[PDB]
Amino acid sequence: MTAVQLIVGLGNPGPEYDQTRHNAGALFVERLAHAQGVSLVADRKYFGLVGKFSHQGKDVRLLIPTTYMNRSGQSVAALAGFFRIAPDAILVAHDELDMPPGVAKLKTGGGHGGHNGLRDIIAQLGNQNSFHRLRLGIGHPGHSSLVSGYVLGRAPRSEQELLDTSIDFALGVLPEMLAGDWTRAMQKLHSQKA
């Protein structure tokens, strides 16, 4: 029932991190900005790249933080604070170790499950975990001590292709996500195959 007003794509900024797995969220927002003809504006007020398009009478902002991943909440609280967007109207796209490339999934609430962008966003929003997440499969290196080197790696072509297919599946339920119809978005999405 709650229209989306902020879509956030997590990533690390800088050529050092560009095209790495940990930036799947920002790739999604970047694709979304492009399809919607939206320009992403370097806005130091929000410590990120900001854009907007109109949907159903409301402005939908797109945010790609330019702080480090671990300080993402600062970007998301700035923009969401200035505009008084509640967590319920926020969607955060992020890399998800727990699903393979090719798989995208939606979730409402829950933990950060170890993702330090999500953890910061949760802390900065006065401890509310209630925002929505678009989980973009990036696979798992199989061990916990490789995680950090893995998210920061660039995936081989086959996995990069499958990430791109799951971002295309996700854009397919954009009408549903923008409306806050999570049940349907989940239904159409979680029925695709890469």
What layout of secondary structure does this protein have?
Elements: E1 6-9, H1 24-35, E2 41-43, E3 48-55, E4 58-65, H2 72-82, E5 90-96, E6 104-108, H3 116-124, E7 132-137, H4 147-151, H5 157-172, H6 174-179, H7 182-189
Parallel strand pairs: 1-4, 1-5, 5-7
Antiparallel strand pairs: 2-3, 3-4, 6-7
Helix pairs in contact: 1-5, 2-3
PDB class: hydrolase
Keywords: Hydrolase
Assembly: monomeric
Beta-strand share of residues:
15-25%
- CATH hierarchy class name: Alpha Beta
Helix content: 25-40%
Tell the overall outline: globular
Side by side, the strands of the main sheet go 2-3-4-1-5-7-6
Number of domains: 1
Total helices: the number is 7
CATH topology: Rossmann fold
**Span between termini:** 29 Å
Number of E-state strands? 7
PDB class: hydrolase
Keywords: Hydrolase
Assembly: monomeric
Entry title: Crystal structure of peptidyl t-RNA hydrolase from Pseudomonas aeruginosa at 2.2 Angstrom resolution
